[PDB]
Amino acid sequence: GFWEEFESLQKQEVKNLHQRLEGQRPENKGKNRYKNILPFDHSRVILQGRDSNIPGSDYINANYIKNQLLGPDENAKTYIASQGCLEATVNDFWQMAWQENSRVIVMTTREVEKGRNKCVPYWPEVGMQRAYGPYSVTNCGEHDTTEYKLRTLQVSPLDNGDLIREIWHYQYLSWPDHGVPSEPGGVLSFLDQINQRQESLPHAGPIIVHSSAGIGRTGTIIVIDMLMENISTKGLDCDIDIQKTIQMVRAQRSGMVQTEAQYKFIYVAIAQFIETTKKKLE
C-alpha cells in the first residue's frame, strides 16, 4: 500500500509549483547543489546583515518549516530545512544559524559518501577555533560513536567576544543518501537526544536540519520528529496522518521525503516509537 500512496504524493508534487526566482538567479548558481532543487521564495531563509546592492547576497538554499497542521493553541518545535554546505556557502550557513538563534543543528549525511561529495565540513576540529565570515566557532568537545557524532560548539561574533552561544551539533552517520537506515532505533534515539536538548533551551530558535540536497533525509527526519512530538505531547492515541504531514511540509520546501522507502521508514519509525512509549507507560 505504500507504493500507491507515495505515487499519489509524487503526482501532487508535480503541481506544487510556486515561485523560486531567488534560487534561479545566475549569481546564486554556485550556492545550489542542484538546479532543480530550490527554496520557494515565500518560505526561504533570507540572510540578514548583507548589502542589498550585492546581487544575491541574501540567499541560502533553505526554508523555514513549521507544523502548519497544529492550531494556534498548540506548542511545537520549528525547523529550518537546509541544503548541506558547499565551500562557497559555509559562511552563509553560519549567518543563518546566528541570526535565527538556532541552538541545535541536525546533520543527516556524511561529508562524502561512496566518493560523492555531500556536505563540506563547517566546524573546527576538536580543541580548535575557526572564523567563518564575521563569526568565530570553537569545537569545545566531541563524542563520536559509529552511529552519530555530537559536537559542542561555541559561537561568537568576531566583534563581540563577550557574546558566546553554545550550539549542539548532531551528525547521524548511518543514513545513506537516497536510502534509509537499516532499523529505526538509531534515528529514534538520536532524535530523543535532539528533542531533549531543544526542550532544555528555552528561547532557542528553530532546529536546523540538513542533509546534502536538503530534502530527502531532511524531510523524512523532520516528519518523524513532528509526529514524535505529537505522540509525546498529545498522547498515544493522537491522530497520525503521514501523507497529510508530508503534503504540509512539501508546501514549505519542494520534494521533502525523496523516496518510497523513506516514506515507509516514517511509518516504521513512528510505529516503533509508539510501542516504546506504550511500554514505558505499562
Side-chain angles (χ1 to χ4, degrees):
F2 296 109
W3 180 88
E4 291 88 343
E5 293 160 6
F6 193 71
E7 289 291 284
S8 179
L9 288 169
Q10 296 292 76
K11 181 174 179 176
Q12 295 172 354
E13 176 66 9
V14 172
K15 314 173 192 181
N16 186 23
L17 303 183
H18 306 276
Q19 290 197 320
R20 304 169 299 155
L21 288 177
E22 294 303 305
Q24 291 171 329
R25 295 173 69 175
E27 55 267 33
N28 290 334
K29 72 181 192 304
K31 306 177 192 177
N32 299 317
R33 282 177 181 276
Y34 301 101
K35 294 186 305 185
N36 65 307
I37 300 178
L38 300 176
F40 295 131
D41 289 337
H42 71 246
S43 60
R44 76 184 180 101
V45 177
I46 302 177
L47 302 176
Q48 302 161 16
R50 300 286 170 94
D51 188 340
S52 62
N53 288 323
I54 293 292
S57 65
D58 72 9
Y59 180 83
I60 189 165
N61 193 324
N63 297 88
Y64 299 105
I65 315 289
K66 61 179 298 183
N67 186 345
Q68 297 169 332
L69 300 180
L70 303 179
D73 52 340
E74 304 190 82
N75 307 113
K77 296 192 303 294
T78 56
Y79 315 84
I80 287 168
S82 185
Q83 174 179 274
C85 293
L86 292 158
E87 303 287 15
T89 68
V90 168
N91 296 347
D92 296 337
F93 180 89
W94 281 112
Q95 172 59 39
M96 174 173 73
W98 186 261
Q99 75 184 37
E100 302 298 340
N101 195 36
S102 300
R103 308 293 310 280
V104 180
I105 299 170
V106 181
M107 172 171 187
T108 58
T109 188
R110 284 178 291 136
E111 296 152 69
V112 180
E113 297 177 3
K114 307 277 195 175
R116 291 183 180 271
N117 300 329
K118 301 293 181 189
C119 182
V120 304
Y122 52 88
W123 54 85
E125 293 302 285
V126 67
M128 299 303 287
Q129 185 183 6
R130 292 282 317 280
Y132 301 107
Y135 304 102
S136 166
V137 178
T138 304
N139 181 339
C140 301
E142 178 167 343
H143 176 177
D144 297 347
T145 70
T146 54
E147 194 155 86
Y148 73 98
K149 305 184 178 181
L150 173 54
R151 291 168 173 105
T152 307
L153 306 180
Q154 286 186 19
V155 187
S156 62
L158 292 174
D159 67 6
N160 196 338
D162 291 335
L163 192 52
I164 304 178
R165 193 177 293 170
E166 195 167 6
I167 298 184
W168 287 264
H169 181 272
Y170 292 84
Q171 182 189 12
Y172 199 78
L173 302 175
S174 306
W175 193 343
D177 200 358
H178 323 300
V180 292
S182 56
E183 185 261 340
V187 164
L188 292 170
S189 173
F190 178 74
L191 286 174
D192 284 338
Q193 288 189 67
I194 285 154
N195 294 336
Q196 289 179 32
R197 184 73 64 185
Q198 180 80 359
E199 287 150 15
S200 77
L201 302 169
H203 313 109
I207 298 173
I208 293 167
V209 184
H210 79 84
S211 45
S212 186
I215 60 168
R217 294 166 289 179
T218 292
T220 304
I221 207 179
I222 286 172
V223 171
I224 292 167
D225 197 71
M226 285 179 174
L227 298 176
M228 289 173 67
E229 182 159 14
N230 290 344
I231 293 163
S232 296
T233 70
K234 297 167 164 300
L236 284 166
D237 56 11
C238 69
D239 181 85
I240 298 295
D241 190 338
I242 292 168
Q243 292 168 79
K244 191 174 178 55
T245 305
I246 293 174
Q247 294 165 337
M248 177 273 300
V249 296
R250 286 179 171 192
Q252 299 171 82
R253 180 170 173 83
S254 302
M256 296 280 270
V257 189
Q258 182 178 60
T259 75
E260 190 269 356
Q262 288 168 357
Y263 174 69
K264 178 178 175 178
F265 182 71
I266 299 167
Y267 282 85
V268 172
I270 289 304
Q272 179 158 317
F273 188 65
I274 288 168
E275 182 64 19
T276 290
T277 302
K278 183 177 64 175
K279 288 192 155 183
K280 283 180 176 179
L281 290 188
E282 248 167 0

